[PDB]
Symmetry: C2
């Protein structure tokens, strides 16, 4: 950002960027500002891009300081309002500078360092990569089983698929909390629940998708949705099944179609669904040729199902480095 | 405490108090300790009572500092382990000094300032008075009605007494949480729920009894027990009905007997039950003679009921200053 401030030395802007830069220059904080090396004096309105990008620099300095303290120590005194909390609170000022340069005839300048910076923001965001979470279904089933046993309503494990779907749906549409603080948990159970609490405590744009290993039925997906909402995940991330064993790939389209048949899930999914297709274990229990062919068929019929339900399907290919995987 | 330290200048003690004094003198913190005016030097083991009572002074200093910060601000950095948290964590050292003085032939000395201090501790505790909470039954009913409506299971107000009892018992014996963060509350509803949260945040020995105004049935008591358990009141305070109007005194023994009839409640009540008997409003709607006589009859038949259930009844007389109340 400091070099970007150095470049944007123009004086022509719109009425818009003029008004915004004047806004920043009003609350300019006439101070020493000696924590920066360059531009420690209050930036004059003669160069408005430097005003706006100077504010961008302030919020970047405080975002970095907050992330550094949050990482090093378990807490931070930095005010959240002093940082960039939104993915495009960051983008807004830079977008404005772009509109200004283009409007005043300076589009070549805008399509330079400012454009590179824009694409870097809109590609890497506030956390370079969105993190995926993966977990095997049996662990979720263990959790739910502890929940139903502690609630004295039965044992989720012994329950048939139908029962799982009905119960999970009633709990998802219900408004009453499920488990409590006094739930008897195992180290595994506490592991998965604590992962959901960590997901809840952290910003939403730092996460990607929750991938379920050894997924076979809609009950596993609805299980992850229920566990997410119940651990108070403010913005729950999308759930995605992982079909890796040949048996799971042969029957995957049927299962995904049954999942789309649940109207509550099709109405929360918002026309977008992602499903993962593993390549490692497919050619391990069966032949390499048989695995490849079944993978092709699987992709084809998954797209067929998604078209049948009007859902935009994005497929997640778990490809390896070696041809064997 | 500092004057008590000055008096206890004996050098004879038991082996018990000797060993304890050596313990305190081991972790004696050889420091300047200049925050006190007197006894800022590490107290020598020659006067063991001064060692022990000096430690008492440290924990009292940090208990006072903690309470002062908790009140003044809203939190305290004072470690709880540095204070007196128990009603008789305080009592232990003083009881020890007493046993020691008595063993060494100094019972007269022990029955002096040390005995006064003992009685003051065991009478006023860490908070001079135990606080009662009182609230009218209709407000608890409003809360529960909001909870059952928000849970879409009916309306607690419209429910008969029987149904209220069965539901409340099922929730009290159940282990699943009731309402949640998203329960629609009124300013009154939030008032009562927030009082239970305040009770939950504060020490148990700072509270007394929860008195229910206009109490008529076991459901009124069980309602408060449930709200206590559900607002995470770690040590719930005893629930006590208040019969003040002549109609309520006429029917108080029947209601208390009906409450003792619920075995679930009698087995938690631990053989002790308190019920309040107001005196103001009785002689206001009916005669003074009639009210007095009905009060007498009420006390008599309540004792009969409690004796019949093997419950130690302690009656709370809401007497006024004027004979009219």
């Amino acid at each position: 950002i400091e070099d970007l401030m150095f470049e944007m030395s123009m004086w022509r802007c719109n009425d818009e960027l003029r008004a915004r830069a004047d806004e920043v220059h009003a609350n300019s904080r006439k101070d020493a500002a000696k924590h920066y090396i360059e531009f420690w004096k209050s930036i004059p309105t003669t160069e408005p891009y430097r005003v706006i990008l100077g504010d961008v620099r302030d919020k970047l300095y405080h975002t970095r300081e907050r992330a550094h303290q949050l990482l090093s120590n378990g807490h931070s005194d930095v005010p959240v309002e002093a940082t960039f909390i939104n993915l495009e609170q960051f983008l807004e000022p830079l977008e404005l500078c772009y509109r200004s340069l283009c409007s005043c005839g300076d589009r070549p300048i805008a399509d330079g360092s400012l454009l590179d910076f824009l694409r870097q923001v809109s590609t890497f965001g506030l956390s370079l990569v969105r993190l995926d979470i993966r977990q095997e279904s049996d662990r979720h089933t263990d959790v739910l089983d502890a929940i139903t046993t502690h609630l004295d309503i039965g044992s989720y494990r012994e329950w048939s698929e139908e029962r799982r779907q009905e119960w999970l749906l009633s709990e998802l549409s219900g408004k009453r909390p499920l488990f409590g603080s006094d739930l008897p948990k195992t180290e595994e159970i506490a592991d998965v629940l604590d992962t959901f609490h960590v997901i809840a405590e952290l910003p939403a744009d730092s996460f990607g998708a929750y991938i379920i290993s050894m997924a076979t039925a809609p009950s596993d997906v609805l299980a992850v949705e229920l566990l997410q909402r119940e651990c108070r995940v403010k913005q729950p991330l999308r759930v995605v099944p992982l079909f890796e064993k040949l048996a799971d790939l042969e029957a995957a389209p049927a299962a995904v179609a049954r999942l789309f048949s649940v109207d509550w899930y099709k109405n929360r999914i918002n026309g977008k669904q992602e499903v993962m297709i593993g390549y490692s274990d497919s050619g391990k229990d069966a032949g390499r040729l048989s695995a490849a062919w079944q993978l092709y068929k699987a992709q084809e019929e998954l797209v067929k199902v998604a078209k049948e339900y009007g859902v935009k399907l994005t497929m997640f290919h778990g490809r390896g480095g070696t041809v064997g995987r």
